[PDB]
Design a protein around this ligand. Structure first.
Ligand SMILES: CCN(CC)CCNC(=O)c1c(C)[nH]c(/C=C2\C(=O)Nc3ccc(F)cc32)c1C
Ligand SMILES: CCN(CC)CCNC(=O)c1c(C)[nH]c(/C=C2\C(=O)Nc3ccc(F)cc32)c1C
Ligand SMILES: CCN(CC)CCNC(=O)c1c(C)[nH]c(/C=C2\C(=O)Nc3ccc(F)cc32)c1C
Ligand SMILES: CCN(CC)CCNC(=O)c1c(C)[nH]c(/C=C2\C(=O)Nc3ccc(F)cc32)c1C
Lengths: 284, 284, 281, 281
């Protein structure tokens, strides 16, 4: 609601933006320094009018970013969720100040390490499921859990980010919007988006994505993939995945049981985040 | 079958390969000249061993190409189906000599003209449906009908090509395999690729594709499309398409009736190729 | 100059930023609206934060560019610098909004242009080049990417990043510009420190390359290896290949030839090129 | 030479072609199996619109290449031409199969290499270069794309398409090789006909560029604009940038500086480079 000159003035007067650590379609993520203290943060600068869109499409983008910042303020404080430290909002742009996560995305870490150990995977998954359990208890569904949306610090501590697809979900109520990354989508989202008669989806979709993340961290490859995206959709919907002999050889049966219980096609038969956390995998 | 040196010797002795007119994963299509006469053809050189594959997958490729060449020999002679003039078959490769179709793919013609007239569309559709009627009478289902698989000569005469997905279908027998271009897929192919209890599909899938082709030739755009492929599938299964006012304005009610009778979700209620050919759109 | 917050405040208070219409290495070009009048413009935002000595080199170079732009502001076929805002990190340059974008993208869409359309573009281009030269400015980066179009298909020369002043009789030495558009004397000079240098004639060789490219839809000196392209330039080896140069007049081929003249002394000036029988109407 | 059916028959009778492991403009590289022994090789299949004169140029050049390859066949760090079959439209060249592919693709995967692994690659690359030079051959296209690796991480120098024999005392002038790897003297004499020419020292400048690139993961002379890259080369302007050169010894920095020496007389020979304390142990 601030004029553009005010949001820009207030941000640049209080913060010193530094090197670019990430880029998006209508945004850039930069390291920044709080001038008065010398303390470091990360700033996401969203350019709301950077894309050519109809006035209706533009108000959709504005309403969605409002939905996101509201959710970010609700969950600010949780140790394994990104903290919105400060915000400068105007009609044309949004300056969102967050925690600086110095080891970047979990995705880039996985690329470097190829595949992670069960010890390091346990630590990441526990933190992730704790964050998901908190969101769920507060009736928030993330709707885009993936290694690209999980950030790391120098102590290898994770913080869940990118709440652009997140929304509130009243207990009992169901969603239908197709959003998220195809490889991480639960069967009920696909069934739902292809068949209008399908009842819809809930918070269980996050736990299917957790199952996909868990598999990918250990295997170094996703459980469902194909050259042709349409053939990937039946493997997801039929829950067709395998613990292939070369990479899944020395992996415990305990983690395979956890993946099996998270990668459950029936959302009613699927583990909740609280259930997943009391799984023996996390009992060390 | 021939040793590799014999297939290569026999082909290169009789034919002079020229310019590349098409590319594939493990194949190239080139214009070629019959050395003794100077007459021109097109040769598809299939490189069976060009991709690194398991011994089982490699025998799948070999069996697949045998299925295709067998079908091509059965249908050779039909005026609106590509003619396999000659073949040199060895373990490692396949040299398939065909008619040279000098105006290339119908798809590229449609791109150039943007949208075709009902007069030119009638001529193409009549020839297409005659070819489809012939295939089905011989218990063959094409399974990938689209403007990219329809070739044109200088006289604007068509020839159906690309029989890589074709198969024999004994009458009354049903298929389940998902293969073929998503935009051209019938609802029953999708429905049974997500509901295992669904009985499967038959030769009617080629006629849905004919309906999609007919719409696209006239509109210059497909009846089902979305940025997200999964939302396009929902439109196909519900048979949700429209004759949009700017491009469908001066188009006859007769062709819109034909399209409606081809883009019929129920395969039993959908026109057969013989039925489509008796429709008043094909009146001379 | 000013603190970062001040240049940003001054720009965003006067202008409303809209859609991105272009991107560069250290810049973005956006459509913008002047809040008080409602008039549309284009703003180039240069981010000089994405050594302190090298950063002042970049600042000094952008000052050289804006100075030249202010001198030429007013010409109907040259981009107009409307406004500018400077800080340590940023540079906000407000220009005319050219709604049909780059001539390069237009050429991609049309594949090749007609002599009639090419005549209109070339006349405007050579008039702008003649003006630049009369004011002792050498553009040094003339190419279809640096020529902008409005809705009336009217041309404006832009991207004065390599431009500089040139007192008559004096010569230049710096190797700059796009390789495909470089005159032979620039390549010759870049090596031999005893070589006398180059002048405003390098702009007219680039005009010759532009003229060829508009008609052919491809450049006269091209290959996969850039080093072999340099040999072609220096020997002035171009051909009017039979498929695309078939329907072309001998009059325009005579013009191309007289612009693509290796000897800068024998090469047509902008005023000479404008008196060519190709521009008689 | 032979009709097309004969070159094809002779090749496919002796070798069983497998998967495509590489592609070029007018060629494909495939793994192949020698039918009688079951041993694996790599075959480069070269295929042919050009004038009859230009087509005989492409033929004569490939004959120059195969002649050089037969002279060098036997060296442990040079690619071995096992066999060759030629026709009007094809050339089948059978070589050693280097299972870890191009050093370039290995560098892409690893991003940057260790000094331990670079010393091992650079020793064998200099030994191959020293051998070529002792036999009066200049490679003229040394780069990571032309260095092949086996499973033991052992190298073999390949792609002799620009190679030529050079009589001692005599000099070359042809501009060829990859721009980023070109020595300053190649650029100086391409433009100036009075410049004396270049010799085998150009391969050692390329070795210096390879050494830099293996350690940095990026080349020493690079720029968004190709024409600014040439200026960088000729002035020998490169830097050991703080993020990627942080954990690199001064010893390897020294050898790079002694190989990336603008004066060819002051530049290290292959035998001299092999006596540097970087290879001592
Ligand atoms: C140059 C080396 N790297 C290789 C891939 C650069 C990539 N990126 C990095 O290292 C990186 C670093 C150090 N932090 C982040 C991102 C965020 C951060 O820290 N707080 C946030 C709050 C919100 C948000 F939306 C993103 C971030 C990245 C992507
Ligand atoms: C000129 C460059 N282009 C791309 C490589 C050309 C566009 N393509 C063209 O013109 C074209 C022409 C002139 N014929 C074909 C294809 C076939 C043909 O004729 N007989 C066949 C038999 C089997 C088959 F599977 C394809 C063809 C194309 C794609
Ligand atoms: C970025 C997305 N699109 C891809 C084709 C947009 C295409 N781009 C377009 O249409 C386009 C338009 C409509 N204007 C411009 C550029 C400028 C302009 O107008 N005044 C200037 C003054 C100075 C300058 F240095 C650039 C411009 C482009 C590139
Ligand atoms: C499809 C391409 N891929 C890119 C990442 C595969 C990577 N590359 C690979 O697998 C590869 C392998 C395993 N060998 C080679 C090349 C040659 C080889 O072995 N003997 C030769 C002799 C001469 C020559 F001129 C090339 C080769 C490649 C390109």
């Amino acid at each position: 609601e601030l004029p553009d000159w005010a949001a820009a003035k207030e941000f640049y007067q209080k913060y010193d933006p530094k090197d670019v650590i990430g880029r998006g379609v209508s945004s850039v993520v930069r390291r920044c320094v709080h001038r008065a203290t010398g303390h470091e943060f990360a700033v996401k600068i969203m350019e709301v009018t950077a894309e050519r869109l109809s006035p209706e499409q533009l108000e959709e983008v504005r309403e969605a970013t409002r939905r996101e910042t509201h959710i970010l303020r609700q969950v600010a404080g949780h140790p394994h969720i990104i903290t919105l430290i400060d915000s400068y909002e105007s009609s044309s742009f949004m300056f969102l100040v967050f925690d600086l996560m110095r080891k970047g995305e979990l995705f880039d870490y996985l690329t470097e390490k190829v595949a992670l150990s069960e010890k390091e995977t346990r630590s990441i998954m526990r933190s992730l499921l704790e964050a998901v359990s908190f969101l769920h208890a507060n009736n928030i569904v993330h709707r885009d859990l993936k290694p690209e949306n999980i950030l790391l610090d120098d102590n290898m501590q994770i913080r869940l980010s990118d709440f652009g697809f997140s929304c509130h979900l009243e207990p009992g109520e169901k969603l239908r919007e197709l959003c998220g990354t195809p490889g991480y989508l639960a069967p009920e989202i696909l069934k739902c988006s292809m068949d209008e008669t399908h009842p819809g989806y809930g918070k269980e979709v996050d736990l299917w994505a957790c199952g996909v993340i868990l598999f990918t961290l250990l295997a170094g490859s996703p459980p469902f993939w194909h050259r042709r995206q349409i053939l990937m959709l039946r493997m997801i919907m039929e829950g067709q995945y395998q613990f292939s002999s070369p990479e899944w050889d020395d992996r415990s049966s305990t983690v395979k049981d956890l993946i099996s219980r998270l990668l459950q096609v029936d959302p009613e038969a699927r583990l909740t985040a609280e259930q997943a956390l009391q799984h023996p995998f996390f009992e060390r």
